[model samples]
Target chain A: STAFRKFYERGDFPIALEHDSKGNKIAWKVEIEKLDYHHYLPLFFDGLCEMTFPYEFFARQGIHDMLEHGGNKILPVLPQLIIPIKNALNLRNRQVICVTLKVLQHLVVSAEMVGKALVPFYRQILPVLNIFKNNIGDLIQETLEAFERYGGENAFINIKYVVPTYESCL
Target chain B: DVKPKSVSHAKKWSEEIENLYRFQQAGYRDETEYRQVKQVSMVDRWPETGYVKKLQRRDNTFYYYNKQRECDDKEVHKVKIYAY
Candidate 1:
């Protein structure tokens, strides 16, 4: 109970974190059991919806504001949210997929500078493509492709400056 | 009571005979049409009103009826029957 509560309070319900004074650590661990619909939806809705809230909107207004003001925290949480969102998509729950996509779209739009935060989440995002494979209809197929393109473009933009050859490879 | 029973029997017999006549007439018309037009083929024809119009018509006539009752009820309702 204490362990669960500790992670829960830290906003890491679907992920466990271990940190030391040295700042060298495995800070994020995926907790599959906690990555259920109930846990993921609330966190996603809270973060995405808050971007539209008056105070939160003003606070995280720009890319600079997002990056300089703790937008880095969103990176780790994204993978956990992605797991359940993918699960929802596999079940052919278009409403859930639409909601999750809206949340992701908001994050990308609001946190333009920190939108690159989605880059590290790409590996987790790839498996989502398979969820819509075979049995998926045209509408869902297009939505999944749109998400892939969004992530690919964001990754290219963020990493290109540092990696130089990133664009060509991507 | 006797008068009512005789009247009801006569009405039932008349209705049955009328239905048989209608059935024979329909069959005869179908045979005549088949003889006149021996080769019947389905053709893909575009409707003056598009898919939405077609869907609306189907929804009102068939889907609404299906939603209200099962296939059997729909079939029975299609062939109007009068009670004696």
Candidate 2:
């Protein structure tokens, strides 16, 4: 329990080493959004959401805040999450992936209400779901339900669990 | 006690459903839409701090919500009037 709440998991979540205006770049930003959503949202994408023990305190508020923001605001920025979301999946850490997915999922629903096309991301997302559904044990049924709610509907046109072709994705 | 189940399975189940829907330009949302996620579910379950939900930063100050089921900041317009 203590380890989970240990402030910074990786050197306070560091970045590309740098010291001045014009120098070799060290890095630590994600999605590259100019958000009023508090800089923390970028940190979450930068690996904060998927790491850090007391993660909820650190990044969850940003998730809720974005949910309140309209899709026109969220859609253009949605593509930025692909790699981090995939990064969480690659690590197989349940909570991190769970939190990461929830925010992305929230954006999808809210954005759709106001007409924002998030389809380009469908292919990137589907294969990840397949991995979650089969690989992770405790995450089984829950994963399936999400697949049904999302991929089951859009990715497959109401056909639960259908993996689509990139061509089909278009 | 509360009513029928709130705070569904896990936010895990939620993340993909919402995003995929958005990416596709559409998806079935029989579940939550636009962030119904009650952040820090585990923390909320802690008997001591369960009532307390979140600690949010607004205009260089911190705000938190617990009872009456409100979370996050109350907006600058409102807080500017009250937060002295």
Candidate 3:
């Protein structure tokens, strides 16, 4: 209520979240007939705030499973997920980070092409993938390919920070 | 607690808070490398419960338990797929 009121009063509420699977806006006003955006956003972010390490992994899996089950063309319009997603790497939960990488793979192909939005976060992401010692070479490959596809060809190919990390994985 | 949420969702909610509490207790070791890591929760704060069960095998993972930290005699350890 407080967060909602403040954002609302300041006229800073989100205008639109993301395009749907079909490249359509999900009409927030229609839902607002019964549910206020203010009422909903808090609970939505709070629900997101609940994930711990394995749960973060599982939540990413849930997204993965959902996409695997069907809805492939959509990307969540939730920019709010960025911090937590990066935080998953910051804390270095291998499962969550790997799952997150897989999740990013789909976003690149999402109708919204959310992979573009992830560019700034790569610095945080690459270091963690490098620091994380594990068995996710395949996932690393997929993530990097998706990254190259989204980040622009050879954009990171010669970047000093990424090359060393990139080589170690291969 | 203001409007009240159904107890149905509360089960996972309570459990995660506890695990996080346990994670905080599973902090860095003496003379161990340290880095900044943020805690992800709505409002509850984590104490300086700096304790944990640090693993060194196969990239040696970090684990936690009890109030002081516990991962021994575990139920089912997650498949190791991170480091090592």
Candidate 4:
């Protein structure tokens, strides 16, 4: 619903969109490792706002593929992703929040140190999470637990500060 | 028929069985069969667990697997080991 669609429509992405008997998936023109994280990852993250059609599909699938294979490439580009993540969560749409929360869960464990890296930025990312914690507690609880599991020693304290009702699962 | 030489149900979990489970999930008997049928020299695999990461089915669509262990103890017995 933003610049993500513009870039996608203009053919700037490296993926080919395909509808198959199995379902929708992105066929990367190049291997995942060959991708430039700084350039492409944030763009994919930005698409998290989309709620319609191929745009939504590609963003969700692309982000999953990239992060799954991303390994060490995901952490350095973490800062660039925060705003898009914030934007998606702020949209306050049920579908969008579900996707964003799942992505956040995956993002933390995608690489070493990535979880702890998110500690300083909890202010930017957690407010909306705090608001939705009551209604969407299932996924919310899971995402917070993921943060605790990988977010190092200070993870619980920072998370507790932002999401005060969150219990320690350590 | 290009039938397997022997078949035995997996009784326990191992890295070898984990990969076999993945290859079979994508409809291949094993990696050897997958490579030979697809005529490719290699298959994409997760470095952490050496499990199959991405598989192209005979229909040419792709399946991407998790980087972590997908085969559990409960599912292990369902994986069949086919010998050439």
Candidate 5:
């Protein structure tokens, strides 16, 4: 259903498979900052739909490292991130949705304007959230709160537009 | 050759030992060994938590860590403290 498998198999990504006593970990072939965000970030987001062991681990960990350190690089690439994020949530798999929700929480706060930037894309990102708002409960509630916190003054209204049941945490 | 003056197993968790656990996981004895072998003036760190955020392994690949506390009580004794 995605191009992530092809790229990973062809070794186009900058990650390597390595593990230690703690567990498996990704070893990047190049520094994260040195990698092209426009090219790689969306690809990793695309992998969020993957539920398998190493694929899931790589995608999840890769996104974590990228978002944590992405800084200004992330905001500019926000547009590219939505489709992949949308696709992951649309999968409707509880585990995938759970992971994507946490990622969304991380994403909104990942950079200065990222949360605000996501406001306009609510149409694309929020419909599924509405669908599972009641079912997913805690994580969905947490993710929505994070959006409101970082999405600026306009955040709550946009979220209310999609998730009508969302009570403003402000 | 550089050798540690004393080596002891860590029995308690402290900010200092938390870092040692990270360094040892990346295959170095500690930050000093990592700096000496990698020959880098500064190791990349997380500004908010001041924890080691990245390390280069012996094969020249990079390992990234979380910004929060990654070490737990169960693994504290595994961290080796080196003195010179």
Candidate 6:
């Protein structure tokens, strides 16, 4: 049952996808022999993404009093984690892309927090902006625009120019 | 433990266990009922085939048949959902 427990521990994800002898669809027939880190990483990133949004939203609403009151020191880790998530999106897995958009949407809603805390890490943040500029749909365009407006001209240089080079891939 | 002594009690216990299984599977439970209607129609024609023309109802929830009397008058409607 350790194997079954491990399968369930993977957070309600399907352990395996298969086709039966008659070519009918089947799943969860056996324990997964290997975990796809690439596939699961997006889900992990999604949790982090959701966590980041409230911080952003609160900051934007001028309700930073709550964030400061809780004395939660978790805010500082966001920029460092964001860089790797941007890199992960470049892997171009569809499931990753879908979850990444959700992460980006929530993060965008909380753009004010990102602008204030992560300003020093502009180089690191640019790739995330580039990802949104290329992959995210129009609904997120306003968020990206807000980032560009607040992040300043220098911060947006790579995304503004470099995005056109790889527009086809997006 | 001893089994239920009466047929009615046994049936009731079996139903309760079945409901327990459903609860165990998803948690929380209830049931409700509503009215529904079924309709049938026939058309006498060819080429254009049987088609639904329009549905008219005073009640917002009512179902209706929009079929054409003959095949020639049929039209397909495409519906789209948009976000504001």
Best by lDDT: 4
Candidate 5 docks at the CAPRI level of incorrect
lDDT of 2 by residue, A1-170 (tens): 13223423544432322334785333443332333222233345554333543454444543555455433444333444555556655566666667656665565565442112334444555455555554243344443344344442353343233343212322
| Model 1 alpha-carbon miss at residue A4, Å | 15
DockQ of each: 0.00, 0.02, 0.01, 0.01, 0.01, 0.01
Model 4, which residues run further than 4 Å from truth?
B1-84
Candidate 6 local lDDT, A5-76, one digit each (tens): 243345444433333587533344323323222223223343322223332232122122212221212232
Q: Candidate 3: deviation at residue A79, Å?
A: 4.0
Worst 10 residues of 6 chain A by lDDT: A58-67
Between 4 and 6, whose TM-score is larger? 4
Tens digits of per-residue lDDT for model 4 on A1-170?
67888878765477886666785566886788967565688889989999888788888998999999998667756767778899889988888999899999989888777888888888788888877886477999888889889988888989889898989545
- Where does candidate 6 clash, by residue pair? B48-B71, B49-B71, B51-B67, B51-B68, B52-B66, B52-B67, B53-B66, B53-B67
lDDT of 5 by residue, B35-58 (tens): 557866457878786688999999
lDDT of 4 by residue, B1-84 (tens): 123457899999987788889989999987556755685534687766656889999999998999988899999999998743
> Which CAPRI quality tier does the interface of model 6 achieve?
incorrect
- Which residue pairs does candidate 1 place in steric collision? none
Residue lDDT tens for model 2, B13-81: 222232222212222121122122222212221234233233322233333343442322322112111
A25: Cα error in model 2, Å:
35
User: What are the chain A TM-scores of the candidates, in order?
Assistant: 0.35, 0.52, 0.51, 0.94, 0.93, 0.40
Where does candidate 3 stray beyond 4 Å? A1-78, A157-160, A167-170, B1-84
The models' CA-based lDDT, in order, is 0.34, 0.38, 0.41, 0.81, 0.80, 0.33
lDDT tens digits, residue span B1-84, model 1? 000011111223232233322322233121112222333221111233111111112123311111121223223323322211
Model 6: per-residue lDDT, tens digit, B29-67?
Answer: 201001011121211212242222232222433322323
TM of each candidate vs. truth: 0.27, 0.39, 0.39, 0.65, 0.64, 0.31
Q: Residues A32-109, candidate 5: write the lDDT tens digits.
A: 986656567888888989887767788889999999988766765676677888888888888889989999999988
